[PDB]
Amino acid sequence: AGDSDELDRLVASCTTECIRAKRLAVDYASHSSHVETIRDALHAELGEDFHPLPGFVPFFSTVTGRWTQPDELDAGYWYRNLRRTVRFADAVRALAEQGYRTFLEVSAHPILTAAIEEIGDGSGADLSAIHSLRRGDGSLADFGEALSRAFAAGVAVDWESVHLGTGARRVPLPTYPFQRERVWLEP
Amino acid sequence: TPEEFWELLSEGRDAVAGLPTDRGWDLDSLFHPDPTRSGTAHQRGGGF
Amino acid sequence: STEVDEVSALRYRIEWRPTGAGEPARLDGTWLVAKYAGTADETSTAAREALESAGARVRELVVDARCGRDELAERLRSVGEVAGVLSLLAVDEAEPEEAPLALASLADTLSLVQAMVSAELGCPLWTVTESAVATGPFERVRNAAHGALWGVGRVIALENPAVWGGLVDVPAGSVAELARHLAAVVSGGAGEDQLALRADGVYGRRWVRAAAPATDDEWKPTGTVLVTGGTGGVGGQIARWLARRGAPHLLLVSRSGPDADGAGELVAELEALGARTTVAACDVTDRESVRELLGGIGDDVPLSAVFHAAATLDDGTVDTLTGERIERASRAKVLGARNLHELTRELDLTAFVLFSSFASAFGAPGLGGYAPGNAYLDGLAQQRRSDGLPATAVAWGTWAGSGMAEGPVADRFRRHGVIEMPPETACRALQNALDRAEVCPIVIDVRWDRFLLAYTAQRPTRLFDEIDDARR
């Protein structure tokens, strides 16, 4: 992660070596030092009462490579998430060597595509890339216009609520056109 | 698909055409004038 | 085994893998359906209904037996610019019993090819045939003489790339494959020069390796061996190998016979290696001559090893190639093989190895009059081996120290492809082929790296797109 007028060099020096090179227009970024100049916003909004609360499913805190730590409850948690590097090489190596073989991405600007190629060089497959929201229904009549693009953006909707009642019935249709290539084993 | 199978049945078309060649079959030891030769088959086709 | 690894790279087979039907492109100009006019043919209408629907129009081009090498040229000049011609002159046509190579379709196709060459038309030619070449041993060849057209077409593909399009084989009797495929086949960008339309799809000629696991089955020369043209080098080394293996009797037969340059030395060598060998000066073209030759074979020994090797050849250039020319050039091959087969229905032959060449296996400039004979041997082996008669159409390459196989085209191909096989390994290749009862082995020393530089250059093809090493 580099400042403005720096990503240009970061991709110019990268395209000459014939490897993955991308740059984003986002003004903020995480796991790289920017929060080093702000220390009055990450440790001043905690007033947690001295009484117990319940929890939920465990999470894997990737802030120190293949960190076995589930979470860091320190006041510098946001700091290390925004400043300390994830060290994603070790993290994605541990993900691939175990069963974690689908990268269900949530943003349209992933920072693990390099990790995707790294895993492709080694063991592990099915490294996914799921996109964000592409609008959605206008209403129930303006329904279809942009919900067709919302479905076609990785966001599955509920189609039994679409046709809950419209006078629609089952119709035989051509199935999946299995793209066929010869895979034969000879004795 | 089942509709194509009905198209096959309705017009009385036989699917028995011949042996496959995509599978890398030898096809040359598969037959012999001697019916008892080991390695040889008897039918000269079949729907495949 | 380790020494038979050379034989495995020697023996090959022709297999018809299912290719594509071709990319259908809207044709223009005209597409002439060249055929005869003696009988009304529904194949004409079946071909046409998808031809004017392909964008062009259809014009009937009637051609008779030896009508002339020029008539079709001014006919095509009169119709105008043509994008291609369908040769429906080889549809449901019986083989004239006078000579397999006297087939009228072969002469008409050669005349049409030379007319298009002389008419400055430059359109691909497609020859429609009815089960002329087997798509596989499962089905059957109706006419081996029609395979001579396929062989001469493979040769023509290496002479006039623009004028020649290829051949399109269809099932005998059925015309649905024409209506289903011809439009995409003739205009296909795939580049297939060998089309075999069938009910299960479309099949293209392919070169595929023949595995040699060294089957325990051994073929022995027991009985008398009838070697046509035994004095000729090809049959010479075959007879020598038979005598070495322990052939009881040898019956080397050729028109020259004892009057051949090397007959006495070969006979002495056979007598030294084997025993009771005989050479005779008998014609093989005449049916009655072969009949009385077999009648004169001593009843003390049955005949089971007819090895047809006789082959006459002067030139194979297409500009002079006409049907009767091939006929009297390779009569000693075709007619002789037909007479031997017709005489050997009632003989329990353990081997009827028809000695053919690579001229039918792939295109061969200067062998255009020689290739039809080898293709007829291929088809005859197909027909015979299909029935209760073992057959083996080995397509030999350049033969070391052998007449007819050696010639100007031999050295030309030696400098742009195959070379003389060692007899010491060609004999083992033939032994292995007889061990499997292989229908049509293709025993070549082809050097794919250098041979394909002159084969696929003028005409890219998928005929060699099945050999793993042919990519290089």
DSSP state letters, A94-121: HHHHTT-------SSS-S-HHHHHHHHH
* B45 has a chain A CB within 8 A of its CB: no
Cβ-Cβ pairs closer than 8 A, A with B, add up to: 8
Angle, CA of C65, C66 and C67, to the nearest 5°: 95
Distance from CA of A184 to the nearest CA of B (A): 7
Q: Name the residue type at position C204.
A: G
- Other C-beta atoms closer than 10 Å to the C-beta of C390 total 23
What distance, in Å, lies between the first and last C-alpha atoms of chain A?
A: 53
Contact C90, C133 (CB under 8 A): no
Angle, CA of C464, C435 and C207, to the nearest 5°: 5
- Other C-beta atoms closer than 10 Å to the C-beta of C226 total 27
Nearest to B29 among C135, C200, C436 (CB): C436
Phi, psi dihedrals of residue C30, rounded to the nearest 5°: -150, 160
- Nearest-10 Cα torsion for C290, C104, C150, C144: -40
Structural determination approach:
cryo-EM
Cα–Cα distance measured from residue C101 to residue C151, given in angstroms and rounded to the nearest whole number: 12
Contacts of C234 (CB under 8 A, 6+ apart): C309, C311, C355, C396, C399, C402, C403, C404, C405
Helix axes C104-118, C146-156, angle to 10 degrees: 20
Instruction: Pick the closest to residue B28 from B17, B20, B36, B39 (CA basis).
Output: B39
> Quick one: A78 exposed, middle or buried, by C-beta within 10 A (0-12, 13-18, 19+)?
middle
Resolution in Å equals 4.3
Q: Look at residue C354 and give its three-state secondary structure.
A: strand
Cβ-Cβ pairs closer than 8 A, B with C, add up to: 54
Cα–Cα distance measured from residue C102 to residue C115, given in angstroms and rounded to the nearest whole number: 20
Instruction: Pick the closest to residue C446 from C425, C422, C421, C424 (CA basis).
Output: C421
B28 contact residues in C (CB cutoff 8 A): 13, 137, 210, 436-439
Contact C421, C394 (CB under 8 A): no
Contacts of C158 (CB under 8 A, 6+ apart): C363, C364, C365, C455, C458, C459
State how far the alpha carbon of A109 is from the alpha carbons of A32, A112, C132, C150, C199, in Å: 16, 9, 62, 60, 52
Cα–Cα distance measured from residue C445 to residue A101, given in angstroms and rounded to the nearest whole number: 51
Phi, psi dihedrals of residue C428, rounded to the nearest 5°: -65, -35
Cα–Cα distance measured from residue C21 to residue C313, given in angstroms and rounded to the nearest whole number: 37
State how far the alpha carbon of A18 is from the alpha carbons of B42, C233, C296, C305, in Å: 59, 62, 81, 67
B24 and A184 in contact by Cβ < 8 A? Answer: yes
Phi, psi dihedrals of residue C246, rounded to the nearest 5°: 110, 35
> Quick one: C280 exposed, middle or buried, by C-beta within 10 A (0-12, 13-18, 19+)?
middle
Distance from CA of B7 to the nearest CA of A (A): 15
Contact C155, C365 (CB under 8 A): yes
Contact C253, C225 (CB under 8 A): no
